[PDB]
Amino acid sequence: HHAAATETETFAFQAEINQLLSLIINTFYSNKEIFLRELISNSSDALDKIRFESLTDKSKLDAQPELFIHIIPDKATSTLTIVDSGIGMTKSDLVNNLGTIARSGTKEFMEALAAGADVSMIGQFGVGFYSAYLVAERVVVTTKHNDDEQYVWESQAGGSFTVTRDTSGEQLGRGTKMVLYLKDDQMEYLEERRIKDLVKKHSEFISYPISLW
Amino acid sequence: AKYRHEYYQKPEEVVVTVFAKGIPKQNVNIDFGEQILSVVIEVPGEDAYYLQPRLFGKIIPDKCKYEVLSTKIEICLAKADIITWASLEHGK
Amino acid sequence: AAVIDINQPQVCKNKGCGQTFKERDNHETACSHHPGPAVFHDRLRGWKCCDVHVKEFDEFMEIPPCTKGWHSSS
Ligand SMILES: Nc1ncnc2c1ncn2[C@@H]1O[C@H](COP(=O)(O)OP(=O)(O)O)[C@@H](O)[C@H]1O
Ligand SMILES: [Mg+2]
Ligand SMILES: [Zn+2]
Ligand SMILES: [Zn+2]
């Protein structure tokens, strides 16, 4: 019993995810805007999960009774933030799902890209999250699952990521927040109209209210 | 595990034998379902033996029987269908 | 398992069933249910057992049980 083991843990990405990241970051794509659709999809999926769980246990929603997605651009910090009240992720979920396990679609998506497939397919190959690196140089994810405490995952896609217990941040209640630190030439995603048109273009018929702030 | 059991079969019935030696008939509770056998044997000094497999085939409870003998218990299961069971228990 | 009473009513916990059953009456095709799991992925809602995936959550709720098996008290 070590009664203080809540530090900061550092993890290496799986080789195939390092490769995926390098492919995403070092090649030119004319449709980088698809990143927003991918993040909205992940939020929608997470909202579905807690919704489903709640059908057999109404107390599942207690920490946040509303199901929503909030998008918050900030010109002062150059960040685009996306918040949802989905099922959120356990500390284990973070490590397992966001870096440390190469899912089967990863190597498959890389081959599909080399053969001629468009990066827009990334969602179908089980790796849509990493598309955030199309426009961001750094991503921090804070997340809160009913079963666990609030944690923060962070990476600049340099071969590693960290996971840190978040005792001081805002405090989500339940769900996840992704903060994207946009690269210099990607500031267009902070404009209200760009976001509005984009949400309308690729999302539009999602089953949960999206608001812009 | 307290007693072992064996079976043999005929086109229309499966005969299960439980090798339990000097058991008084009143201590033997056996019941039959559509596709399950229930055998519960009380042992005053110890925990009760039970054998309650889901069966490989369907049976006809009303036509099933058993006899408690000096040396063993013989149970006759009436098959619902004329087929050779590959085992006694379902999925085995 | 522990000992059971084949005459005792139970609630089946298989998805899409929830019926009360006895077990003396149970059998290999008694219960119609989705073995599951439910799948919520890339904006589609569905069931991995029958591989039907639908689009609307409410629609997903109407996808009929796909499998006949044993009722299960757990
Ligand atoms: N907003 C979110 N809320 C909860 N979990 C998430 C969120 N975004 C991503 N995840 C987790 O990360 C995993 C990987 O996401 P992604 O790379 O888009 O692949 P996929 O959605 O195909 O599984 C998801 O399966 C999910 O478990
Ligand atoms: Mg995805
Ligand atoms: Zn199904
Ligand atoms: Zn059932």
Numbering used by the authors:
A (entry chain A): -2 to 210
B (entry chain C): 150 to 241
C (entry chain E): 148 to 221
Sentences from the paper on this structure:
Hsp90-mediated function of NLR receptors in plant and animal innate immunity depends on the cochaperone Sgt1 and, at least in plants, on a cysteine- and histidine-rich domains (CHORD)-containing protein Rar1. Functionally, CHORD domains are associated with CS domains, either within the same protein, as in the mammalian melusin and Chp1, or in separate but interacting proteins, as in the plant Rar1 and Sgt1. Both CHORD and CS domains are independently capable of interacting with the molecular chaperone Hsp90 and can coexist in complexes with Hsp90. We have now determined the crystal structure of a ternary complex between the nucleotide binding N domain of Hsp90, the CS domain of Sgt1, and a CHORD domain of Rar1, providing a framework for understanding the architecture of Hsp90-Sgt1-CHORD protein complexes in plants and mammals.
The N-terminal domain of barley (Hordeum vulgare) Hsp90, the CS domain of cress (Arabidopsis thaliana) Sgt1a, and the CHORDII domain of cress Rar1, were expressed, purified, and cocrystallized in the presence of ADP (see Experimental Procedures). The structure was solved by molecular replacement with the structure of the previously determined binary Hsp90-N-Sgt1-CS complex (Zhang et al., 2008), and refined at 2.2 Å resolution (see Experimental Procedures and Table 1). The overall architecture of the Hsp90-N-Sgt1-CS-Rar1-CHORDII (H-S-R) complex is a puckered heterohexameric ring with approximate diad symmetry, and with the subunits in a cyclic a, b, c, a, b, c arrangement, so that each protein contacts only one copy of each of the other proteins. As expected (Heise et al., 2007; Shirasu et al., 1999), Rar1-CHORD is a metallo-protein domain with two structural Zn2+ ions. The three-stranded face of the Sgt1-CS structure, opposite the Hsp90-binding face, provides the binding site for the Rar1-CHORDII domain.
